[PDB]
Design a protein around this ligand. Structure first.
Ligand SMILES: CC[C@@H]1C(=O)N(C)c2cnc(Nc3ccc(C(=O)N[C@H]4CC[C@H](N5CCN(CC6CC6)CC5)CC4)cc3OC)nc2N1C(C)C
Length: 127
């Protein structure tokens, strides 16, 4: 099996805007997670071919990763902060679907999610 194409990161047929929440999501949330020790498995789409995991995309039908999220933010792909937050949560949830609780990768994801939730609790105000 091939990899699927990666998630779309730009779309000129969607209106675009910058908001202080979206800016915060890039400059604080993404930045903070990205530089974490355990960020690396989540910085790009899962290359199931390289990892020789033919079952990964048989079960994960909404893949998501921070590389994609970062590009989406950089390309003003999101109109609402909640769209971006949903992408992070999808990424975490995917990990908790494919992998056994307590596995290495799950502990890693959990560490990131804790930091994620901490930064989101500090999200600035709408406008
Ligand atoms: C899939 C199931 C499960 C799961 O749920 N997730 C999310 C998951 C995700 N990922 C992995 N693995 C890997 C991930 C990544 C790599 C990599 O090579 N990463 C490299 C990417 C290129 C990097 N860079 C360095 C600087 N370059 C340019 C800068 C200098 C200018 C840019 C290029 C260096 C690091 C290797 C992996 O494994 C060998 N496993 C996963 N697991 C399991 C297998 C448990």
């Amino acid at each position: 099996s091939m990899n699927p194409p990666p998630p779309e990161t730009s779309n000129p047929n969607k209106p675009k805007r910058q908001t202080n929440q979206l800016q915060y999501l890039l400059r604080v949330v993404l930045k903070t997670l990205w530089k974490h020790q355990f960020a690396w498995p989540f910085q790009q789409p899962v290359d199931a071919v390289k990892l020789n995991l033919p079952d990964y995309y048989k079960i994960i039908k909404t893949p998501m990763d921070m590389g994609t999220i970062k590009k989406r933010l950089e390309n003003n792909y999101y109109w609402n902060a909640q769209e971006c937050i949903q992408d992070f949560n999808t990424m975490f949830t995917n990990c908790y679907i494919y992998n056994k609780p307590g596995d290495d990768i799950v502990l890693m994801a959990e560490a990131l999610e804790k930091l994620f939730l901490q930064k989101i609790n500090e999200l600035p105000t709408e406008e």
